[PDB]
């Protein structure tokens, strides 16, 4: 098992790296009809009778 | 290879993949018919023009 440290320094007073989002490659889940199932959620209540 | 892992998530293990690759071994067979009696006059010597 070889560890390897190492330390990284920041030499400069302000931010100096940049990202942005450049193409969409996918999109990944749809934007779909679903619905959260609140009686999974919430699956201790319920209504009296 | 794999990127050693700088994170405690898993150990970066090696990887090395033992992959058996089968052979297409193929037949080819045209044919070609001759006739014998080309073949007489094969085997027969010539001394007339």
């Given amino acids: ?49 | 290879p794999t990127i050693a892992h700088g994170d405690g998530r898993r150990p970066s293990k090696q990887r090395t993949f033992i992959v058996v690759k089968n052979c297409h071994k193929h037949h080819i067979s045209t044919e070609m018919e001759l006739s014998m009696l080309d073949l007489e006059i094969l085997h027969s010597i010539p001394e007339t023009p």
């Fill in chain 1, 1 to 49: 098992e070889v560890h390897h440290e190492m330390a990284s320094i920041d030499t400069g007073l302000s931010y100096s790296s940049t990202m942005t989002p450049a193409r969409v490659a996918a999109i990944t889940t749809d934007m779909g009809i679903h619905t959260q199932d609140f009686f999974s959620v919430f699956p201790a209540e319920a209504f009296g009778n």
